Design an enzyme around this catalytic site. Sequence first.
Site, PDB file in Angstrom:
ATOM      1  N   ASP A   1     -31.257 -19.937  10.301  1.00 62.84           N
ATOM      2  CA  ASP A   1     -30.272 -20.846  10.901  1.00 62.84           C
ATOM      3  C   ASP A   1     -29.360 -21.485   9.846  1.00 62.84           C
ATOM      4  OD1 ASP A   1     -28.973 -22.100  13.039  1.00 62.84           O
ATOM      5  OD2 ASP A   1     -30.434 -23.761  13.162  1.00 62.84           O
TER       6      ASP A   1
ATOM      7  N   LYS B   1     -35.912 -38.485  11.277  1.00 64.86           N
ATOM      8  CA  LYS B   1     -35.469 -37.595  12.350  1.00 64.86           C
ATOM      9  C   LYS B   1     -36.345 -37.797  13.591  1.00 64.86           C
ATOM     10  CE  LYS B   1     -34.745 -32.560  13.313  1.00 64.86           C
ATOM     11  NZ  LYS B   1     -34.475 -31.210  12.655  1.00 64.86           N
TER      12      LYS B   1
ATOM     13  N   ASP C   1     -32.984 -28.386   7.851  1.00 62.39           N
ATOM     14  CA  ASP C   1     -33.231 -27.965   9.259  1.00 62.39           C
ATOM     15  C   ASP C   1     -34.006 -26.631   9.378  1.00 62.39           C
ATOM     16  OD1 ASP C   1     -33.353 -27.722  11.979  1.00 62.39           O
ATOM     17  OD2 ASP C   1     -31.199 -27.757  12.378  1.00 62.39           O
TER      18      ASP C   1
ATOM     19  N   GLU D   1     -36.187 -36.582   3.067  1.00 57.82           N
ATOM     20  CA  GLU D   1     -35.300 -36.944   1.960  1.00 57.82           C
ATOM     21  C   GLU D   1     -33.893 -37.253   2.506  1.00 57.82           C
ATOM     22  OE1 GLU D   1     -34.800 -33.733  -0.987  1.00 57.82           O
ATOM     23  OE2 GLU D   1     -33.291 -34.856  -2.114  1.00 57.82           O
ATOM     24  N   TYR D   2     -33.322 -38.388   2.083  1.00 57.68           N
ATOM     25  CA  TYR D   2     -31.959 -38.797   2.472  1.00 57.68           C
ATOM     26  C   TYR D   2     -30.910 -38.095   1.585  1.00 57.68           C
ATOM     27  CZ  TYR D   2     -27.870 -42.059   2.155  1.00 57.68           C
ATOM     28  OH  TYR D   2     -26.614 -42.617   2.043  1.00 57.68           O
ATOM     29  N   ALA D   3     -29.911 -37.458   2.208  1.00 55.48           N
ATOM     30  CA  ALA D   3     -28.841 -36.788   1.477  1.00 55.48           C
ATOM     31  C   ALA D   3     -27.579 -37.639   1.546  1.00 55.48           C
ATOM     32  CB  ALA D   3     -28.568 -35.403   2.044  1.00 55.48           C
TER      33      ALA D   3
ATOM     34  N   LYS E   1     -29.502 -31.153  18.710  1.00 49.91           N
ATOM     35  CA  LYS E   1     -29.933 -30.866  20.085  1.00 49.91           C
ATOM     36  C   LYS E   1     -31.080 -31.766  20.538  1.00 49.91           C
TER      37      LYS E   1
HETATM   38  N1  LIG Z   1     -31.863 -35.889   5.477  1.00 49.66           N
HETATM   39  C1  LIG Z   1     -30.617 -36.177   5.945  1.00 49.66           C
HETATM   40  N2  LIG Z   1     -29.712 -36.924   5.267  1.00 49.66           N
HETATM   41  C2  LIG Z   1     -28.474 -37.166   5.772  1.00 49.66           C
HETATM   42  N3  LIG Z   1     -28.041 -36.697   6.955  1.00 49.66           N
HETATM   43  C3  LIG Z   1     -28.850 -35.916   7.728  1.00 49.66           C
HETATM   44  C4  LIG Z   1     -30.209 -35.621   7.240  1.00 49.66           C
HETATM   45  N4  LIG Z   1     -30.814 -34.848   8.150  1.00 49.66           N
HETATM   46  C5  LIG Z   1     -29.929 -34.673   9.164  1.00 49.66           C
HETATM   47  N5  LIG Z   1     -28.761 -35.294   8.905  1.00 49.66           N
HETATM   48  C6  LIG Z   1     -27.597 -35.293   9.834  1.00 49.66           C
HETATM   49  O1  LIG Z   1     -28.090 -35.129  11.168  1.00 49.66           O
HETATM   50  C7  LIG Z   1     -27.759 -33.818  11.673  1.00 49.66           C
HETATM   51  C8  LIG Z   1     -28.847 -33.149  12.515  1.00 49.66           C
HETATM   52  O2  LIG Z   1     -30.074 -32.957  11.795  1.00 49.66           O
HETATM   53  P1  LIG Z   1     -30.923 -31.586  11.993  1.00 49.66           P
HETATM   54  O3  LIG Z   1     -32.207 -31.788  11.179  1.00 49.66           O
HETATM   55  O4  LIG Z   1     -30.052 -30.422  11.593  1.00 49.66           O
HETATM   56  O5  LIG Z   1     -31.246 -31.656  13.567  1.00 49.66           O
HETATM   57  P2  LIG Z   1     -31.311 -30.459  14.653  1.00 49.66           P
HETATM   58  O6  LIG Z   1     -32.652 -29.796  14.425  1.00 49.66           O
HETATM   59  O7  LIG Z   1     -31.280 -31.156  15.970  1.00 49.66           O
HETATM   60  O8  LIG Z   1     -30.095 -29.630  14.371  1.00 49.66           O
HETATM   61  C9  LIG Z   1     -27.364 -32.999  10.442  1.00 49.66           C
HETATM   62  O9  LIG Z   1     -26.459 -31.956  10.795  1.00 49.66           O
HETATM   63  C10 LIG Z   1     -26.747 -34.067   9.555  1.00 49.66           C
HETATM   64  O10 LIG Z   1     -25.422 -34.339  10.013  1.00 49.66           O
HETATM   65 MG   LIG Z   2     -33.696 -28.047  14.799  1.00 52.46          MG
HETATM   66 MG   LIG Z   3     -29.393 -28.685  12.539  1.00 51.90          MG
END
Ligand SMILES: Nc1ncnc2c1ncn2[C@@H]1O[C@H](COP(=O)(O)OP(=O)(O)O)[C@@H](O)[C@H]1O
Ligand SMILES: [Mg+2]
Ligand SMILES: [Mg+2]
Length: 265
Positions: free
Chosen positions: A130, A36, A148, A85-87, A17
Amino acid sequence: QWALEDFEIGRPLGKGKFGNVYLAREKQSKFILALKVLFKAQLEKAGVEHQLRREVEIQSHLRHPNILRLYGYFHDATRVYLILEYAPLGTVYRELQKLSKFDEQRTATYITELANALSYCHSKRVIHRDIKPENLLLGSAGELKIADFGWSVHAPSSRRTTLAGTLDYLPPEMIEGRMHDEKVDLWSLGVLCYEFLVGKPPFEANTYQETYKRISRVEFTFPDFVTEGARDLISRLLKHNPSQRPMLREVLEHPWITANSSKPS
Ligand SMILES: Nc1ncnc2c1ncn2[C@@H]1O[C@H](COP(=O)(O)OP(=O)(O)O)[C@@H](O)[C@H]1O
Ligand SMILES: [Mg+2]
Ligand SMILES: [Mg+2]
Ligand SMILES: Nc1ccc(Oc2c(Cl)cccc2Cl)nc1
């Protein structure tokens, strides 16, 4: 300390979002991570500054193999940057889209890893609120990591921010705007267990108004292929009354879990 100039940006990892997440490399050390990015104007417009601060404070002090690390943050007058951290193996969401359904062994193993992570969280009276497939990430060995923490808090609580997207994972006390505690995450654990085995969440519907109806009345049914062990666990988690939901040790010790999970507690 850190600034944008310290990083080389690479491919987009995902969208949220507010979040726009990129692969990145730190220049001096060559360390690979995820950045992020949030736009200040959108944070201000939506009034969710306090949620972002909570995300940084809660997630940075946690240390558990099944919880994604947050290392730091910085900002530059249009944007805020979280250093994560990168996943490398992506989201549980993406894996579920690829396979349609998980088998009993994959499911029980994911549930064990989730319950471990949540037990550590609840021991600090932190509730996530969440849990859902787009917020569960996969490490290099395929292990699950909760991510998240934008909606997380300390218990007990009411809600101060408007409910944005899907109702599908929230319990009755949350959607009815009542007071809630740790047990909200146990309800979400039940929704997840069902969605992993069946391919869709148990109260899914075409409209908000009726999804609301199905959740508050706890109207779900099982397809034939769901075994008796899985039905027993799911039925225990999806109780209207929070206090009747099991403890996390009871989940980790359930006979269906111990028979099918390939990880311990
Ligand atoms: N640390 C990460 N490593 C790899 N992919 C990620 C990582 N963080 C987020 N993502 C990708 O980006 C998307 C959105 O990140 P998120 O932190 O959940 O944002 P929001 O708070 O807007 O939902 C995740 O659903 C995933 O697909
Ligand atoms: Mg969020
Ligand atoms: Mg999210
Ligand atoms: N401790 C902390 C963590 C994150 C954070 O984000 C910001 C920033 Cl940098 C600027 C404006 C609004 C918000 Cl919400 N501010 C403080």
